[PDB]
Design a protein around this nucleic acid. Sequence first.
RNA 1: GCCUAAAAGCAGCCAUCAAUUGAGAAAGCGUUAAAGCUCAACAAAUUCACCAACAUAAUCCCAAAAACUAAUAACAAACUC
Length: 85
Amino acid sequence: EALKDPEVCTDPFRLTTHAMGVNIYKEGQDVVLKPDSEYPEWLFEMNVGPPKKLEELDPETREYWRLLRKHNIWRHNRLSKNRKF
RNA sequence: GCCUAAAAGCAGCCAUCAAUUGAGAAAGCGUUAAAGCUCAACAAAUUCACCAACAUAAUCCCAAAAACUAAUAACAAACUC
Ligand SMILES: [Mg+2]
Ligand SMILES: [Mg+2]
Ligand SMILES: [Mg+2]
Ligand SMILES: [Mg+2]
């Protein structure tokens, strides 16, 4: 009762060559890495780092108000920490 | 994600990102651990809503009573006329 024993057989090479965890069935057939001429641009056109900020988003789009609602929930949780019930 | 017999939002430590118009890797109950009951977010309305209240002694309680007819009243000394 643990995880799969197969984990990075040749870590310096195989992991760069392709991903082995995508194959789920017992029949071992690993998929090719599909070089950069296959995936579309939206894969690289997304933030792959730290998220944005409320003092950086513009108050005319929806993600700004989404982050503001998240911060409002956080503030309510911080304030309601003294629930004596 | 680690630790742990188990740590599923909730012994704990670190991150706290991600779709939906909209729901915190979760602010409180609950389970050994789950489950389950709530809170905050949308859609449904919108009275006001922050703190303030706390026992008793011994012979027998201790004037009786009275919320509205006009009050800078009146009655009241060895004071003063
Ligand atoms: Mg959203
Ligand atoms: Mg609610
Ligand atoms: Mg008593
Ligand atoms: Mg007199």
